[PDB]
Ligand binder design. Sequence first.
Ligand code: 31O
Ligand code: DQW
Ligand code: CL
Length: 112
Amino acid sequence: GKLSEQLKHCNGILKELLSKKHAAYAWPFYKPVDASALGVHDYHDIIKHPMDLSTVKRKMENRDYRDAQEFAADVRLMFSNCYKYNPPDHDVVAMARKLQDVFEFRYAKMPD
Ligand SMILES: COC(=O)[C@H](C)[C@@H]1N=C(c2ccc(Cl)cc2)c2cc(OC)ccc2-n2c(C)nnc21
Ligand SMILES: C[C@H](O)COC[C@H](C)O
Ligand SMILES: [Cl-]
Protein backbone atom coordinates (compact mmCIF):
# COMPACT_ATOMS: atom_id res chain seq x y z
CA GLY A 1 0.00 0.00 0.00
CA LYS A 2 0.93 3.67 0.39
CA LEU A 3 4.29 4.46 1.95
CA SER A 4 4.18 6.38 5.20
CA GLU A 5 5.14 10.03 5.00
CA GLN A 6 8.61 9.24 6.34
CA LEU A 7 9.12 6.46 3.81
CA LYS A 8 7.99 8.83 1.04
CA HIS A 9 10.86 11.10 2.08
CA CYS A 10 13.18 8.08 2.04
CA ASN A 11 11.99 7.16 -1.44
CA GLY A 12 12.67 10.72 -2.56
CA ILE A 13 16.19 10.49 -1.20
CA LEU A 14 16.70 7.17 -3.01
CA LYS A 15 15.51 8.69 -6.28
CA GLU A 16 17.97 11.55 -5.80
CA LEU A 17 20.89 9.21 -5.05
CA LEU A 18 20.11 7.43 -8.33
CA SER A 19 19.73 10.64 -10.35
CA LYS A 20 22.09 12.12 -12.95
CA LYS A 21 23.26 15.02 -10.80
CA HIS A 22 25.06 12.60 -8.45
CA ALA A 23 26.09 9.96 -10.99
CA ALA A 24 29.77 10.98 -10.99
CA TYR A 25 30.23 9.57 -7.48
CA ALA A 26 27.11 7.43 -7.07
CA TRP A 27 27.67 4.98 -9.93
CA PRO A 28 29.75 2.42 -8.01
CA PHE A 29 26.79 1.98 -5.65
CA TYR A 30 24.17 1.32 -8.31
CA LYS A 31 24.44 -2.49 -8.34
CA PRO A 32 25.75 -5.25 -6.07
CA VAL A 33 29.53 -5.55 -6.00
CA ASP A 34 30.47 -8.29 -8.49
CA ALA A 35 33.54 -9.64 -6.71
CA SER A 36 34.57 -12.03 -9.48
CA ALA A 37 34.18 -9.38 -12.18
CA LEU A 38 36.28 -6.89 -10.19
CA GLY A 39 38.87 -9.48 -9.18
CA VAL A 40 38.29 -8.91 -5.47
CA HIS A 41 38.28 -12.54 -4.40
CA ASP A 42 38.40 -11.66 -0.70
CA TYR A 43 35.38 -9.31 -0.81
CA HIS A 44 32.84 -11.78 0.58
CA ASP A 45 35.22 -12.96 3.28
CA ILE A 46 35.43 -9.36 4.50
CA ILE A 47 31.91 -8.08 3.74
CA LYS A 48 29.31 -10.33 5.32
CA HIS A 49 26.28 -8.21 4.43
CA PRO A 50 26.51 -6.70 0.94
CA MET A 51 24.23 -3.78 0.08
CA ASP A 52 23.74 -1.48 -2.89
CA LEU A 53 21.19 1.01 -4.17
CA SER A 54 19.44 -1.43 -6.54
CA THR A 55 18.78 -3.66 -3.54
CA VAL A 56 17.48 -0.72 -1.47
CA LYS A 57 15.22 0.20 -4.39
CA ARG A 58 13.82 -3.32 -4.68
CA LYS A 59 13.18 -3.42 -0.93
CA MET A 60 11.36 -0.08 -1.07
CA GLU A 61 9.18 -1.20 -3.99
CA ASN A 62 8.40 -4.48 -2.23
CA ARG A 63 7.53 -2.58 0.97
CA ASP A 64 10.25 -4.47 2.82
CA TYR A 65 11.16 -1.42 4.91
CA ARG A 66 8.77 -0.92 7.75
CA ASP A 67 10.16 2.48 8.72
CA ALA A 68 12.72 5.17 7.84
CA GLN A 69 15.23 3.81 10.34
CA GLU A 70 15.36 0.44 8.57
CA PHE A 71 15.92 2.20 5.24
CA ALA A 72 18.70 4.39 6.67
CA ALA A 73 20.44 1.37 8.22
CA ASP A 74 20.68 -0.25 4.77
CA VAL A 75 22.00 2.87 3.04
CA ARG A 76 24.58 3.31 5.80
CA LEU A 77 25.51 -0.39 5.64
CA MET A 78 26.30 0.13 1.94
CA PHE A 79 28.72 2.95 2.76
CA SER A 80 30.21 1.07 5.72
CA ASN A 81 30.99 -1.90 3.50
CA CYS A 82 32.91 0.45 1.24
CA TYR A 83 34.85 1.93 4.19
CA LYS A 84 35.57 -1.56 5.53
CA TYR A 85 36.95 -3.13 2.36
CA ASN A 86 38.86 -0.23 0.83
CA PRO A 87 41.86 1.80 2.05
CA PRO A 88 40.64 5.24 3.17
CA ASP A 89 42.59 7.03 0.44
CA HIS A 90 41.08 5.11 -2.48
CA ASP A 91 38.92 6.87 -5.08
CA VAL A 92 35.85 4.76 -4.36
CA VAL A 93 35.99 5.81 -0.70
CA ALA A 94 36.04 9.51 -1.66
CA MET A 95 32.95 8.83 -3.76
CA ALA A 96 31.26 7.07 -0.83
CA ARG A 97 31.94 10.04 1.47
CA LYS A 98 30.43 12.43 -1.07
CA LEU A 99 27.30 10.34 -1.64
CA GLN A 100 26.93 9.82 2.11
CA ASP A 101 27.10 13.58 2.59
CA VAL A 102 24.23 13.93 0.12
CA PHE A 103 22.34 11.20 1.93
CA GLU A 104 22.87 12.33 5.53
CA PHE A 105 21.94 15.97 4.94
CA ARG A 106 18.68 15.16 3.20
CA TYR A 107 17.84 12.33 5.62
CA ALA A 108 18.19 14.90 8.42
CA LYS A 109 15.32 16.85 6.79
CA MET A 110 12.96 13.96 7.58
CA PRO A 111 9.39 15.24 8.05
CA ASP A 112 7.53 14.96 11.33
C1 31O B 1 39.88 -3.39 -5.97
O1 31O B 1 38.90 -2.82 -5.12
C2 31O B 1 37.61 -2.78 -5.66
O2 31O B 1 37.42 -3.00 -6.84
C3 31O B 1 36.46 -2.44 -4.74
C4 31O B 1 35.88 -3.71 -4.14
C5 31O B 1 35.40 -1.74 -5.55
N1 31O B 1 35.90 -0.55 -6.16
C6 31O B 1 35.11 0.07 -7.16
C7 31O B 1 35.68 1.33 -7.73
C8 31O B 1 37.02 1.43 -8.03
C9 31O B 1 37.51 2.61 -8.56
C10 31O B 1 36.66 3.67 -8.78
CL1 31O B 1 37.28 5.17 -9.44
C11 31O B 1 35.32 3.58 -8.49
C12 31O B 1 34.83 2.40 -7.96
C13 31O B 1 33.71 -0.37 -7.50
C14 31O B 1 33.44 -0.46 -8.86
C15 31O B 1 32.19 -0.84 -9.32
O3 31O B 1 32.00 -0.99 -10.70
C16 31O B 1 30.70 -1.31 -11.15
C17 31O B 1 31.31 -1.34 -8.37
C18 31O B 1 31.56 -1.23 -7.01
C19 31O B 1 32.79 -0.79 -6.56
N2 31O B 1 33.04 -0.83 -5.15
C20 31O B 1 32.34 -0.48 -4.07
C21 31O B 1 30.94 0.06 -4.14
N3 31O B 1 32.97 -0.67 -2.92
N4 31O B 1 34.25 -1.19 -3.29
C22 31O B 1 34.25 -1.28 -4.69
C1 DQW C 1 32.63 10.81 5.39
C2 DQW C 1 32.01 10.08 6.56
O1 DQW C 1 32.29 8.70 6.44
C3 DQW C 1 30.52 10.30 6.54
O2 DQW C 1 30.28 11.68 6.71
C4 DQW C 1 28.92 12.05 6.68
C5 DQW C 1 28.85 13.56 6.69
C6 DQW C 1 27.41 14.00 6.76
O3 DQW C 1 29.45 14.06 5.51
CL1 CL D 1 21.65 3.51 11.45
